T-cell receptor, first 199, second 240 residues
Framework: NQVEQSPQSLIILEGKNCTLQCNYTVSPFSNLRWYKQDTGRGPVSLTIMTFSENTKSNGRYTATLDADTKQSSLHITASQLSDSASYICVVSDRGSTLGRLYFGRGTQLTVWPDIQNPDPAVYQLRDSKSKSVCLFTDFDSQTNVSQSKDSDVYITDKCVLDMRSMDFKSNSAVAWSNKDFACANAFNNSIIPEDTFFP | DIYQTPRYLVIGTGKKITLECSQTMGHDKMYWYQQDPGMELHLIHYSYGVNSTKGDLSESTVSRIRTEHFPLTLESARPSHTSQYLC?????????????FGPGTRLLVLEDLKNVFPPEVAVFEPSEAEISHTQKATLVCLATGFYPDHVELSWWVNGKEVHSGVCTDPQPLKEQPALNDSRYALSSRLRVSATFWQNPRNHFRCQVQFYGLSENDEWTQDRAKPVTQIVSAEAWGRAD
């Protein structure tokens, strides 16, 4: 590939800064752009740059271009959950009629909420009566919760939830089964902390 | 803006497909991209202008007749085509400009449609334990037994869609992951203040939009045809 990105992926807490790297062998050079592609959605143009302009700014994003060393950097300031996405470095090249674009493999960025006061708990949601659900919530970000097929029991991946009026953010995960199933069964001691609210 | 339809399409082998791309921005240059999962974007077709017709990647054809419209066509469909298809345009710049993208189309070509199933949606009301403890109420929605993966889940409170306090699984779960074609399950959470939930005049509705077959499609099975459709579940706030 003629467009290279670094790192492959990284995970940061909200409010912190990160820098993404891009290196290219594309010749002759024309221009450099950074795309932000949210999961499942289409790419969004952030910044475009040429050899003449070594810097560009869009919001909390700031891009840099060194044409000599053929390298570019994207700097995110005060990261937000919405920043989680793939970041694509796109390099443009001069042409006989018009243009060519070289897309590099994106850098995966994941932003986690910074949870000041964890209040981890496991609740049982009233059965619809129309399988029953268990809710593991308020745990901090470091907690690893993934999907599980044992046996007719299911567990989902943790997900961040933002209540904007209360400036509140929380992580949650859900588990359910048709069967014997109880909430203390769905989430066992691994992984839940030693202090976890059960009723 | 820039528009694309359909968002999700599932279709059988041999059938003809047409994908819509439209822009009111009056851009002369337009692009089509094919993107596989964890794949880079691939230029498939592009057009300089209003008669201009092959990209860097090599069966589909594109038609540019009127400026605003740049549809893409697959004459005969094959599983090989399964992928996401993005359309883009370009603004004014030194004679590529700024590139704008549509929402894209997730295209799934199956040889047999017998496996397609509609989802079942269920809402689960907040626990009393959570309310008194956190002074907050979380509702959970489950959509299950659906295939293919084409789904859009949304929450509607008192008639209006709400994005705040909502979390949805990025990826759906396979119910039987050992199996290649397997119906799915997807959950979502809506969290609101306790008093809010404790108001009985408050209505909560979890909606899943399923993209299935069409009336045009053939169905020989016993169960009702799994056509595109909306499946809902609702709860009314509970006074304690």
């Amino acid at each position: 590939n003629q467009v290279e990105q670094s790192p492959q992926s990284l995970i940061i807490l909200e409010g912190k800064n990160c820098t993404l790297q891009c290196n290219y062998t594309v010749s002759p050079f024309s221009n450099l752009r950074w795309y932000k592609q949210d999961t499942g959605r289409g790419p969004v143009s952030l910044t475009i740059m040429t050899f003449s302009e070594n810097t560009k700014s869009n919001g909390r994003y700031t891009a840099t271009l060194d044409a000599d060393t053929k390298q570019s950097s994207l700097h995110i300031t005060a990261s937000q959950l919405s920043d989680s996405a793939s970041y694509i470095c796109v390099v443009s090249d001069r042409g006989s009629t018009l243009g060519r674009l070289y897309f590099g493999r994106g850098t995966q960025l994941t932003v986690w909420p910074d949870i000041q006061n964890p209040d981890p708990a496991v609740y049982q949601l009233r059965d619809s009566k129309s399988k029953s659900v268990c809710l593991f919530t308020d745990f901090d970000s470091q907690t690893n919760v993934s999907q599980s097929k044992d046996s007719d029991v299911y567990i989902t991946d943790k997900c961040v939830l933002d209540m904007r009026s209360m400036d509140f953010k929380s992580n949650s995960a859900v588990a359910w089964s048709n069967k014997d199933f109880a909430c203390a069964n769905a989430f066992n001691n691994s992984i839940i902390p030693e202090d976890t609210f059960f009723p | 803006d820039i528009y694309q339809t359909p968002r999700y399409l599932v279709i059988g082998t041999g059938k003809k497909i047409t994908l819509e791309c439209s822009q009111t921005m009056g851009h002369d240059k337009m692009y089509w991209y094919q993107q596989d999962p964890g794949m880079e974007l691939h230029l498939i077709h592009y057009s300089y202008g209003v008669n201009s017709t092959k990209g860097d990647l090599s069966e589909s054809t594109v038609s540019r007749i009127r400026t605003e419209h740049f549809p893409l066509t697959l004459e005969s469909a094959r599983p090989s085509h399964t992928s996401q298809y993005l359309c883009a345009s370009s603004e004014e710049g030194a004679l590529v400009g700024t590139q704008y993208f549509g929402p894209g189309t997730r295209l799934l070509v199956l040889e047999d449609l017998k496996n397609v199933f509609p989802p079942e949606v269920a809402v689960f009301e907040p626990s009393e334990a959570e309310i008194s403890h956190t002074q907050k109420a979380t509702l959970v929605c489950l959509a299950t037994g659906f295939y293919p993966d084409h789904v859009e889940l949304s929450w509607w409170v008192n008639g209006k869609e709400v994005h705040s306090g909502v979390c949805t699984d990025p990826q759906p779960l396979k119910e039987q992951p050992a199996l290649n074609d397997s119906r799915y399950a997807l959950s979502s959470r809506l969290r609101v203040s306790a008093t809010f939930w404790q108001n009985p005049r408050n209505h909560f509705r979890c909606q899943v939009q399923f993209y299935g077959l069409s009336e045009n499609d053939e169905w020989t099975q016993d169960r009702a045809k799994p056509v595109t459709q909306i499946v809902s579940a609702e709860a009314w706030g509970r006074a304690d």
